[PDB]
């Protein structure tokens, strides 16, 4: 009714996850395996310096502005058997985008100023290892307005259109270069979003832009 503490995990072996479950059980702690607004805390497997790989849950918890923390929180909490403070075991960074980019931290604070605010996005098919609808959710949670087809781009002039795709995901079709024809709006890779999100700050479209053909 007022406050709750649900959880998910990610990057965990089955094996490890059981000692999680155990703890959760112990401390009257909710735990789901599928993630939502309801989720508050998000546990990740890390290195000693709280650096982790980039799983889908990783990305989403940050976007949500959720408490992203290391498994070592638990192992320690277990060691003491005692509810240790989460804050300390917050994630500093990840493998790709720096071991201490403080992104999740930044997410938590920078809520008033959601990175993709003002932006219309058509997560244009196709993709892998995260379905569009998820990707779509991700950006909504970073302020983005979301579009379902190319035509449907609201036009003019405050609003910014942008197109995202996962090109390698295109079976026998180098067709992503034509999109420049389908609409004049920018075409960028997923990478942009992910990295934008990983740091919680909207990135330069340049690096991630995608050649087009007229």
């Amino acid at each position: 009714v007022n406050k709750r503490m649900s959880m998910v995990v990610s990057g965990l072996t089955p094996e490890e996850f059981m000692l999680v479950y155990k703890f959760a059980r112990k401390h009257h702690i909710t735990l789901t395996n599928l993630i939502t607004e309801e989720t508050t805390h998000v546990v990740m497997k890390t290195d000693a310096e709280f650096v982790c790989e980039r799983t889908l849950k990783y990305f989403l918890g940050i976007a949500g502005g959720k408490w992203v923390v290391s498994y070592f929180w638990v192992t320690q909490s277990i060691k003491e058997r005692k509810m240790l403070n989460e804050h300390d075991f917050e994630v500093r960074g990840d493998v790709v985008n720096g071991r201490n980019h403080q992104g999740p931290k930044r997410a938590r604070e920078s809520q008033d100023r959601k990175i993709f605010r003002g932006l219309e996005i058509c997560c244009y098919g196709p993709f892998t290892n995260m379905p569009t609808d998820q990707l779509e959710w991700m950006v909504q949670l970073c302020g983005a307005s979301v579009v379902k087809e190319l035509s449907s781009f609201t036009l003019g002039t405050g609003v910014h259109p942008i197109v995202v795709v996962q090109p390698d995901a295109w079976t026998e079709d180098n067709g992503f270069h034509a999109i420049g024809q389908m609409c004049e709006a920018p075409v960028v890779t997923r990478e942009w979003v992910l990295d934008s999100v990983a740091l919680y700050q909207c990135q330069e479209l340049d690096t991630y832009l995608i050649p087009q053909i007229p």
Binding site: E53, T55, N129
Partner: peptide
């Protein structure tokens, strides 16, 4: 299949 792993990026 007793599997299986979380995807990375």
């Amino acid at each position: 299949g007793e599997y299986s792993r979380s995807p990375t990026f």
